[PDB]
Design a protein around this ligand. Structure first.
Ligand code: BGC
Lengths: 126, 130
């Protein structure tokens, strides 16, 4: 299924069409804010963005992207289901996807879940 | 590696080439090397699927279970890539019949004439490169 991910700053995770880094900066979920959750096997998930490419952790080396033409790895995630119904995403490197409060592009370099690393999600299409 | 994909049945198992050895099954718990298929352009808007053994997936015209042991493309090895309403995909062989996971209960087939629950697959492009 296709979902949007809403970050700590109340904006939505934006694939940026695979140009440059991903950001948590959109006011409303539209095509670029819809991600197909992929069952990558063994509790791991991947995310296919609007451009048909896959979200990568970049191993924490740089801000996260949505440009990979195929899942390997840096593109599989643990989908952690939090107490409050939110989700966190843990990358290949054991670090957590962070919305960075919209202050900078999204990262996967933080070793623990805090506010910025919890997302509200709901299924949506079109 | 943008055209090498896996196919996941709604039974949550992945389509498996069986490395040519016998019929294909939708029973693998994890998308491994036998679970990856390169989508080859077969012309006229049709596609072929080449398994890990470098050979081609065949419908067998629905007369027996599907196999991945053809050296080259003809047909029973061409398929329509059907994109479904829900994000899943289906594959319609040259006989007009659709590829079925058979819910992992028997080997994969291509003899059912319409798209039902076992003829819809989740897909993703994946690579073994690490
Ligand atoms: O409507 C498709 C996309 O257009 C872009 O210009 C916006 O930044 C995205 O947020 C939107 O999802």
């Amino acid at each position: 299924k296709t979902i949007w991910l809403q970050g700590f700053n109340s904006k939505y995770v934006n694939s940026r069409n695979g140009q440059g880094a991903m950001w948590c900066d959109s006011d409303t979920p539209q095509a670029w804010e819809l991600f197909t959750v992929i069952d990558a096997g063994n509790g791991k998930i991947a995310l296919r963005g609007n451009n048909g490419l896959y979200v990568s952790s970049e191993n924490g080396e740089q801000a996260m992207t949505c440009n990979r033409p195929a899942i390997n790895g840096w593109e599989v995630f643990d989908w952690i289901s939090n107490s409050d119904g939110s989700v966190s995403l843990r990358g290949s490197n054991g670090m957590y996807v962070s919305s960075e409060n919209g202050e900078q592009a999204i990262t996967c370099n933080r070793p623990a879940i805090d506010g910025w690393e919890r997302f509200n999600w709901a299924a949506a299409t079109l």
